[PDB]
Amino acid sequence: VPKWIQLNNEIMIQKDGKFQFDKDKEAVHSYFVDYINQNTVFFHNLKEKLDYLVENQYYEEEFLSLYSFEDIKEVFKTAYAKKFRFPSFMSAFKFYNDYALKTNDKKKILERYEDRISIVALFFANGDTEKAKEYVNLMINQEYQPSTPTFLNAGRKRRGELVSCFLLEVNDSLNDISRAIDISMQLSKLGGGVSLNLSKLRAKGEAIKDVENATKGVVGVMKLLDNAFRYADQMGQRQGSGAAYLNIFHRDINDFLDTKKISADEDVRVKTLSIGVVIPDKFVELAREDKAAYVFYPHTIYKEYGQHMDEMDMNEMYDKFVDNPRVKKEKINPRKLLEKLAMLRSESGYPYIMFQDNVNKVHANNHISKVKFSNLCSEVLQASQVSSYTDYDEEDEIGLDISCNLGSLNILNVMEHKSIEKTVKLATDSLTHVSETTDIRNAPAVRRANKAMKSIGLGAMNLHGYLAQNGIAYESPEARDFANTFFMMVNFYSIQRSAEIAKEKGETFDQYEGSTYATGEYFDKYVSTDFSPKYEKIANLFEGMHIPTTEDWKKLKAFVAEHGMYHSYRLCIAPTGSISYVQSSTASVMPIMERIEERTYGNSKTYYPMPGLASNNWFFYKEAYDMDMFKVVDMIATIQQHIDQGISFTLFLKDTMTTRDLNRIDLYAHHRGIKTIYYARTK
Amino acid sequence: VPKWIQLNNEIMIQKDGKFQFDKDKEAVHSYFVDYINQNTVFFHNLKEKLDYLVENQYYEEEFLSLYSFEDIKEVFKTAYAKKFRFPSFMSAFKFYNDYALKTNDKKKILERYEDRISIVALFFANGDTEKAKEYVNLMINQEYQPSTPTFLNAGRKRRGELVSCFLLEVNDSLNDISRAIDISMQLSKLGGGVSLNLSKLRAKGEAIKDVENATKGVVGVMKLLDNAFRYADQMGQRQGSGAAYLNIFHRDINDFLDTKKISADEDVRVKTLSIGVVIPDKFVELAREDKAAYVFYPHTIYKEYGQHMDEMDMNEMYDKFVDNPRVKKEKINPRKLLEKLAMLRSESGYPYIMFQDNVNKVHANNHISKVKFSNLCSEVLQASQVSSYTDYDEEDEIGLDISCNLGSLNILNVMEHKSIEKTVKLATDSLTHVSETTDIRNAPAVRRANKAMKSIGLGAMNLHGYLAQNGIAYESPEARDFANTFFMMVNFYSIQRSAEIAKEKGETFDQYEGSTYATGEYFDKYVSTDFSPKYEKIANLFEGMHIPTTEDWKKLKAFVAEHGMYHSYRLCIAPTGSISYVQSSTASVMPIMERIEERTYGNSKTYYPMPGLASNNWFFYKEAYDMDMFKVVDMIATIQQHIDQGISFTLFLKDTMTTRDLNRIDLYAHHRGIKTIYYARTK
Amino acid sequence: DFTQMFYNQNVKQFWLPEEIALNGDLLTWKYLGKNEQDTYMKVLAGLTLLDTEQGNTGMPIVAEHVDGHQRKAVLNFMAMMENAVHAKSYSNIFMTLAPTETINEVFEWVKQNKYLQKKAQMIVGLYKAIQKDDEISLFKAMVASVYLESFLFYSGFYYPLYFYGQGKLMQSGEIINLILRDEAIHGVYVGLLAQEIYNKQTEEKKAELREFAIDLLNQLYENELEYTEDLYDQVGLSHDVKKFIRYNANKALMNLGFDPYFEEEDINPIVLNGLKATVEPLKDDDFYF
Amino acid sequence: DFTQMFYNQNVKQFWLPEEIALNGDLLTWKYLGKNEQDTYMKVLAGLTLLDTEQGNTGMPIVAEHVDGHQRKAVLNFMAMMENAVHAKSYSNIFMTLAPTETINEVFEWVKQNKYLQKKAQMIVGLYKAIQKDDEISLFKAMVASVYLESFLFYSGFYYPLYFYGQGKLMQSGEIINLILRDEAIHGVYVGLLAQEIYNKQTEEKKAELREFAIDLLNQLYENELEYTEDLYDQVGLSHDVKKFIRYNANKALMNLGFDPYFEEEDINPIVLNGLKATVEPLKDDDFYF
Ligand SMILES: Cc1cn([C@H]2C[C@H](O)[C@@H](COP(=O)(O)OP(=O)(O)OP(=O)(O)O)O2)c(=O)[nH]c1=O
Ligand SMILES: Nc1nc2c(ncn2[C@H]2C[C@H](O)[C@@H](COP(=O)(O)OP(=O)(O)O)O2)c(=O)[nH]1
Ligand SMILES: Nc1nc2c(ncn2[C@H]2C[C@H](O)[C@@H](COP(=O)(O)OP(=O)(O)O)O2)c(=O)[nH]1
Ligand SMILES: [Mg+2]
Ligand SMILES: [Mg+2]
Ligand SMILES: [Mn+2]
Ligand SMILES: [Mn+2]
Ligand SMILES: [Mn+2]
Ligand SMILES: [Mn+2]
């Protein structure tokens, strides 16, 4: 048993009726002094280390050649000038086991935390020494954390893509289905999660060019995609993860849901394919009034109207579809479908729930397209256009497939540094750089949408950690007040930075002129409502920091009208799974699942108290399962009103909660404006 | 019970110790006058019939527009002047259930046998009235039978392709694997059977861009292809049929064979994918000497030598691969592998066995490529060049993927009419037309190889029927003498027709000048050895029909050298499954399995005596299971020496014989020059 | 003189329901009346109960008391077939044809059905009354087992066979025929063991054992009549099924070495219509010809 | 959470002795020394004798006391494999390698052997001590069963695997490998059933059951060391066999959800080469807030 593992295990040994939280500092100190400093390759000078890394196929010479070695040395000086110390053993362990650069035999350590941060900053700045130093200060202060792909792979020769979330539209054709399988395998090969919209595919028992009842439906494509993701398993390193989305009004919705039942047949069940259900307001209205609903065969609708069923507004088109004799449908019970959804989420956590009209009532790019589905993590909500992949000899009609770049603000560190504006703008610049430098050669729609939309996702994390370390309960109205003010400021400065980038480059995103940013409809609630804190305690948290006012929002609206907006999408709150340990932060804006995290690595068990947990703030670190999910919905809806994309919203349920309770949580989320629901986690 | 199937069941009622074979004539007469004439749509004149069929999307207007209606009327008169009568109930039942045109609701019958034959003939002739009449005479006399795709779809609007056998080479890349899956689904959608070579794919545990043990092997691609063929099943009426081929020296050969074991897990076993094993003479030599053989990792060989393993000569490079330290190899026992092959064929009928050096020592187009795999029916043996499907933005290097049009001579009717030459030439013309009118716009390599190679497959059937109806035992030397003379004559006239077509069109097949036809080496055994029958009984069977001598073969060799050959491949003997009933013929050149064949169609049981079966030739219709497989191998090898492609050779095994007997049959087939072994059928 | 041949026959008959694809019955099932589907579900549920107890209790307990490793191996194999193969196959059929609620309801129905509970009570009671080294209690349980194998299953088997014979539900019917083929050999085998014990007795004791067997048969028979009427009256077949169970009662008696008890009757002809390779190593001389 | 999965894995592993031809082993058997032939015979008889106890008592007694139809079916299947497949396989190996008189003498010797008897009777004692409706006594028997399946067999399996890894006695080695693969899954399955009982206990009762398991393991282990020296010293293998025993003891403990007892050791490379919360309807007013 390692000495640091023993020291970390002494946290649970209760001395004087309290956990020994101070043992984790001893644990991390022992871990470093006994393992990391021993296994860290040291070089006489930074020049020798850099030469070894570039020449041994560890780094990329292209981005490092943009600086004189003096500038790189000063950047590394800035990283090491902070004397950053990992507060807990788990932070250092996670970094040096997941993100630190190791030798080709994975025996020694080439990169410390400062080296990784310096390389990421030098890649972000793209030749600017002052910008690189600013990125170094931002990341070594741990105010901004680039996503796991960006943080892990930036500046590495043998790297995967810096983007890991992709959203593909699948057209109703064998050519398009085969192309979707190919692109899914190509993107999973790069290490990215792939989400596929299956709503355009015609249901089971539909006609294929005069041969009726010949289509296997969305479940055959689901099996194809599941095997494609199983094959493209990231070189046998990490299991290939993909998601499939289907509209709740699709005829195959029940077959779609039956793929996740525990009793599912092996010719129906899918293993590596997550499922998400898209629910328009029409379905919730039908279930509310207990009227019997209809699911429609998409190809009949396409033949009758020339438009896909998911391309049309179900609120206005549902009655026309039902009254159309040439549109094929079967009766369903919407309440029974809702209960089936809740039962499936209780049993397996699936499907994801995307409230279509909650997303699109505040969507800023409805002119480009409505948001029809989400990503594998249920936070990316962007307009997509389906591609028409024709025969081999013909020319394909390339659409827009969603792929956004992820980054997370550390709410605790941004708040303690009083640097919401600077951190938000620098994170926007880094995400923009990642977007520009991303070129995917086997997903033409993804590449086209990356070049045109220039969409980024700037998330946040350590919300519960910041609140509990400041004596604020997560469910308290003061917590929602802080979330309101903080994310209003984040949205303000992200919009300002996007407009500044548009002014600097003289270009906006494609089809910006039709957006609500161009017409000013986006800024209505910001030029009409004041989002300053309503509590003196919360207003004191923002001391020394200018909270944007209504006049500031009017000035921003005028600036955006004059100069445009560079990013179609800017903010999305991803789960931030493994980077939260490195940042000593609670995951995303979700509340903590456990106060102290018990995990086993190898044959030794490890203990991870939540960051900042102590005796004084023990009960402010309320576990998510002990919380009222209605108040968590209230918090996420408070945040969601300032996030243009969605938020990964996990439901934390007790074992005593019934199907009716899960349905009530889902319906209250729909009522409160929640866009997506990620997971149903039961204790 | 239907009257016709009641009459057909009176065959088995033994009267005076004999089967009532004449009941089948009464059975078919009742079948017609009680079902067919009642359910047949009859029009006032042929003009109304043709107008009705063209207008209601049953026929194609383009091919019928090349003839004035007087010519079409003359063709239909020629078809009906024969007054063809089906000799058995099964012939008419199979035709009117599988190939006769029916109304859109599958209610009534639009085409008789004469109508279908006339339409196929007018399609073949392509505007020529006299040629259409010649084709009508050829098919109404049942001397030549177009394959099931051609006979079923010739001249129909809503039709599949006229070719159903496709062979695909898969390169060792994810782009090429995705393209292989796409092309397999596209061709299965067209109704064709697709065979894929998986030898170029690197084995399990190979590196994918310097990360080791990353490749899932050929079994992952096998699962992908199996699900692709399950998806593209054409309503499931005829589910997607695929074949995978692996060289026996591939490292994944044991896992490739384990996909067919009964005890295989659901994560390994493939169900819709047939498997074939390509065995070079090196493997048979290694097993014969009981030496230690080695299977190789294909990617190591490709990296070391720059060529794929299956693109190299194993009999000359096996020792170099073994001695090469940079080539990765695994030790196997070749005799244990042979025993495993025999056990797998006994328990499942798989794999197909291709003797690669038996195919390539007589292959005429080794300059283009060596034959590396066979088709799903294990009789197409043509040169293929792998394609290089690149990224979306890059141009693809299109290779040569095999596909040939099938057609069978009826040996009994051809020999009765003394029309080997005319039947062979007309069948060659029809197959050439089918090749010219085929355009696969989603399989680039299939299209390119169809345009370049112009390969056709002209098979034969009713060999056992003809021999049994002429008092010749299938195993007798006289039967092999007849097969030798008959198929030498067929080869002579097919080569003559190919040379005449090349002379008329002024073009040969691509890379003809490097072929053995151009060098004249192909004709060595024909200008040196006389193939006239050695028995007076057989010599009288060919009386009235000129048998080409050595002088005739020398003249043909000069003609080919001076004019070239239009088809790279001309003759392949396919199984000819369902068209054998319509033609009242035994299936292919293989011996019959049952003298009287009992089948259940729906809830009706009906019996099919072999064509011409009686008491005077009961024992000449010896079942395939009761005869020596060594003599059947001798017969197939006698036929194979005149066939440029392979012969679908089914092994008929008793329950008593062990795996050693199956291995002995396989080794004797390899010794006797058998190119492929199709099935190990056990009774 | 017989165990080895029964061992070989039992192991060569080994099968799993998954070998038979059931989706082919979907349409002929859909087409049956509600009465027909109800009777069919209930019939198979009654069979499931019998096999559950034959596998859990009957065969293992008889195996425990019968001497000889080979006899025990046969009885253990038969026990496995009862609960690991037969009882499970019915769930494969149910899961294909019926929605979960109908499946739940039919299993609730077996628990509360008085005839099915009575027959289980009687048969299992005799199994659990076996006393170690007491051959008479063992004989009584073997008679009960033969009556379960060769008589009691048949009120259930009638209906799948009746459909199979009309070309309906033929995949389910194929499963049932395999089950029936097994039970026929199980009934013969247990019958032979029972006869062994019977043949050891005095004439006076034999007379009592025949009384036991006939009294038990009559008691089971009277209960089976009521069960048959309860299930089959709604499909109009009760009288036909009754003839079938009497036919099979005679076969059970014969398996026990006793004379037939019921007079012969004409059975529905529809129901009558309802009824690896050795590895040898390659030699060197095999490679030359 | 696990019985249907184990059902699947068990039935798909089904095999029969006849599938492997044994006669070709005589071509390597004739080349072994007397000590090698003696050790092999003694090891084989040891495995045979222990496996018979498992088929006649161990599996059927556990199947009897475990509640659940699906568990009883899996357990029945495992008992079948012991009696119908494994026992016939061991007999076949013996009949191939030794004449009748030699087989009878080896079994006489191993039947009297102190170390074989000690472990055989210790295990059987725990099976005989199971009491109706007492889950503690059932757990103790399950521990004994797991120790037999996952630990005690392995001092024996060592030798056939050792030959199998060298290219000697390949046909019987293939058979032994199939048997061993069955015992592995048997041990894992019974282990999960034991953990289910263990997890229903108080903390004090758990500590008491852990002490029982470790104490039993210690007794069996010390006897295994003596058993090992008694058989393997004459062929010079005891040191390596002891490492294999400890490695398999650790697997047995892990099957019972316990920590490994012995430090990790490398194994002989030749032997290695051989080797639903609650559904509630929405009752309206849940759509209004
Ligand atoms: C991407 C991928 C490839 N493979 C296998 C299948 C292909 O035959 C083989 C080649 O993959 P490639 O697509 O050629 O990968 P690569 O070009 O980046 O690697 P290399 O430089 O070695 O050519 O790798 C997998 O098994 N799983 C996977 O996820
Ligand atoms: N010497 C050295 N410095 C390293 C290494 N990895 C990162 N660094 C950082 C530490 C300093 O901030 C910076 C410059 O180190 P140096 O080259 O030793 O500089 P100097 O102090 O000699 O001027 O590089 C490393 O491996 N060696
Ligand atoms: N009348 C008619 N003839 C058909 C039909 N299908 C095929 N035929 C064939 C039969 C004859 O050989 C040929 C000409 O038939 P027709 O048009 O009736 O001409 P005719 O009998 O007046 O010369 O067409 C059909 O449906 N009607
Ligand atoms: Mg289309
Ligand atoms: Mg490549
Ligand atoms: Mn049974
Ligand atoms: Mn039985
Ligand atoms: Mn055993
Ligand atoms: Mn066991």
Nearest to A25 by CA among A580, A623, A612: A612
- The length of chain A in residues reads 683
Chosen from A442, A446, A448, A451 to mutate, greatest number of chain B CBs within 10 A: A442
Q: Which residue has the tokens 């070594």?
A: A140
Domain that holds residue D245: 1-275
- The letter for the amino acid at A671 is H
Structural domains of chain B sorted by starting position, each given as residue range(s) with its CATH number in brackets? 3-142 (no CATH), 143-280+334-683 (3.20.70.20), 281-333 (no CATH)
The contacts found for D196-199 with CB under 8 angstroms, 24 or more apart, are D197/D135, D197/D136, D197/D138, D197/D139, D197/D142, D198/D139, D198/D256, D198/D257
Give rounded-to-5 percent helix, strand, coil for chain C. 80, 0, 20
- Chain A to chain D, count of Cβ pairs less than 8 Å apart? 45
Dihedral over alpha carbons D68, D72, D74, D76 (to 10 degrees): 180
Q: How far apart are CA C175 and CA C22, in angstroms?
A: 9
Tell me, what DSSP letter sits at residue A638?
A: H
Cβ of C289 within 8 Å of Cβ of B667? The answer is yes
Q: How far apart are CA A651 and CA A344, in angstroms?
A: 13
Residue D287 is assigned to a structural domain of this protein: no
Residue C260 is assigned to a structural domain of this protein: yes
| A43, A44, A45, A77, best to mutate for ligand 2 pocket (most atoms within 8 Å of CB) | A45
Q: How many CB atoms lie within 10 A of CB A4?
A: 25
**What end-to-end distance do the CA atoms of chain D give, in Å?**
38
Asked if residue A174 lies in contact with residue A82, where contact means CB atoms within 8 angstroms, the answer is: no
Contacts of B48 (CB under 8 A, 6+ apart): none
Could you tell me whether strands A679-682 and B402-403 are parallel, antiparallel, or unpaired per DSSP bridges? unpaired
Tokens for B343? 């056990």
Considering every ligand atom, which ligand is closest to the CA of D87?
8
User: Coil, helix or strand for A682?
Assistant: strand
- For residue B154, CA distances in Å to A257, B60, B166, C15 come to 44, 9, 19, 46
Contacts of D267 (CB under 8 A, 6+ apart): D240, D243, D244, D247
Whether B215 is in the pocket of ligand 1, judged by its Cβ within 6 Å, is yes
Nearest to B652 by CA among B671, B615, B680: B680
Tell me, what DSSP letter sits at residue B353?
A: E
Query: What CATH number is associated with residue C255?
Result: 1.10.620.20
Cβ of B265 within 8 Å of Cβ of D12? The answer is yes
- List the A242-247 sheet strands across, edge first: A165-169, A193-197, A242-247, A273-279, A352-355, A676-677
- The letter for the amino acid at C68 is G
Asked if residue D144 lies in contact with residue D136, where contact means CB atoms within 8 angstroms, the answer is: no
| A74, A76, A133, best to mutate for ligand 2 pocket (most atoms within 8 Å of CB) | A76
Residue C282 is assigned to a structural domain of this protein: no
Q: Which residue has the tokens 């059929």?
A: C93
- For residue C118, CA distances in Å to C124, C222, D211 come to 10, 11, 47
Q: What is the resolution of this structure in A?
A: 4.1
Tokens for B271? 């169900």
Considering every ligand atom, which ligand is closest to the CA of B219?
1
- The letter for the amino acid at A115 is D
Residue D116 is assigned to a structural domain of this protein: yes
- The letter for the amino acid at C6 is F
Contacts of C29 (CB under 8 A, 6+ apart): C37, C97, C169
User: Coil, helix or strand for A399?
Assistant: coil
Residue C261 is assigned to a structural domain of this protein: yes
Asked if residue A271 lies in contact with residue A227, where contact means CB atoms within 8 angstroms, the answer is: no
Q: How many CB atoms lie within 10 A of CB A642?
A: 21
Q: How far apart are CA A89 and CA A97, in angstroms?
A: 12
Question: Which of B111, B161, B311, B379 is flagged as catalytic?
Answer: B379
- For residue A633, CA distances in Å to A168, A472, D280 come to 29, 17, 22
Assess whether the previous peptide bond of A325 is cis (omega < 30° from 0): no
Asked if residue B12 lies in contact with residue B607, where contact means CB atoms within 8 angstroms, the answer is: yes
Q: How far apart are CA A279 and CA A248, in angstroms?
A: 5
Exposure string of B631-653, with b = 16+ CB inside 10 Å and e = fewer, is bbbbbbbbbbbbbbbbbbbbbbb
- The length of chain D in residues reads 289
Write the DSSP assignment of A522-570 as a string of letters: GGHHHHHS--S-SSHHHHHHTTTS----HHHHHHHHHHHHHH--S-S--
Q: How far apart are CA B466 and CA B621, in angstroms?
A: 10
Tokens for A506? 């003289």
Tokens for C162? 């009746």
Q: How far apart are CA B498 and CA B569, in angstroms?
A: 10
Q: How far apart are CA B413 and CA C136, in angstroms?
A: 77
Tokens for D265? 């050791």
**Which residues of C are the active-site residues?**
90
Nearest CA in chain B to A205: B235
Q: 3-state SS string over A85-120?
A: CCCCHHHHHHHHHHHCCECCCCCCECCCHHHHHHHH
The number of domains in chain C is 1
Q: How far apart are CA C56 and CA C79, in angstroms?
A: 7
Residue C50 is assigned to a structural domain of this protein: yes
Write the DSSP assignment of B561-620 as a string of letters: HHH--S-S----B----SHHHHTT--STTSPPS-SEEEEEETTEEEEEEPTT--STTTTT
Q: How far apart are CA D289 and CA D286, in angstroms?
A: 7
Residue B52 CA to ligand 3 center (angstroms) comes to: 14
Distance from CA of B239 to the nearest CA of C (A): 15
Q: 3-state SS string over C221-262?
A: HHHHHHHHHHHHHHHCCHHHHHHHHHHHHHHHHHHCCCCCCC
Write the DSSP assignment of B404-415 as a string of letters: -EEEEEEHHHHH
Binding-site residues from annotation of C:
51, 82, 86, 149, 183, 186
Q: Which residue has the tokens 């509340």?
A: A591
In A233-344, the DSSP E strands lie at 242-247, 273-279, 293-296, 329-332
- For residue D229, CA distances in Å to A288, D205, D225 come to 77, 37, 6
What's the number of CA atoms in the CB half-sphere (13 Å) around residue B442? Answer: 21
Helices marked H in B511-549 = 516-519, 524-528, 536-541
What's the number of CA atoms in the CB half-sphere (13 Å) around residue A540? Answer: 7
Q: Which residue's alpha carbon is at the smallest distance from atom 4 of ligand 3?
A: B46
Q: Which residue has the tokens 């024996």?
A: D156
Q: How far apart are CA A417 and CA A544, in angstroms?
A: 10
- For residue B287, CA distances in Å to B294, B335, B363, D165 come to 11, 5, 25, 22
Q: How far apart are CA B187 and CA B179, in angstroms?
A: 12
Q: How far apart are CA B496 and CA B504, in angstroms?
A: 12
Q: How far apart are CA B581 and CA B85, in angstroms?
A: 13
Q: Which residue has the tokens 């063209």?
A: B54
Closest ligand 1 atom to B217 CA: 26
Instruction: Give residues whose Cβ lies within 5 Å of ion ligand 7.
Output: C 149, 183, 186
A650: β partners: A679
Q: How far apart are CA C228 and CA B561, in angstroms?
A: 86
Nearest to B160 by CA among B64, B79, B244, B232: B232
User: Coil, helix or strand for A402?
Assistant: strand
> H/E element holding A354?
strand A352-355
Whether B390 is in the pocket of ligand 1, judged by its Cβ within 6 Å, is no
Is residue A375 annotated as a catalytic residue, yes or no?
Answer: yes
Distance from CA of D284 to the nearest CA of A (A): 7
- The length of chain C in residues reads 289
